[PDB]
């Protein structure tokens, strides 16, 4: 279950940062 991100962005925003 991932329609957008079931949760998943409380890593994505730390590599948001991360990355360029």
């Given at each position: 279950?991932?329609?957008y991100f079931?949760?998943?962005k409380?890593?994505?925003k730390a590599?948001?940062?991360v990355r360029a």
């Amino acid at each position: 279950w991932d329609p957008y991100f079931a949760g998943v962005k409380k890593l994505t925003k730390a590599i948001l940062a991360v990355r360029a």
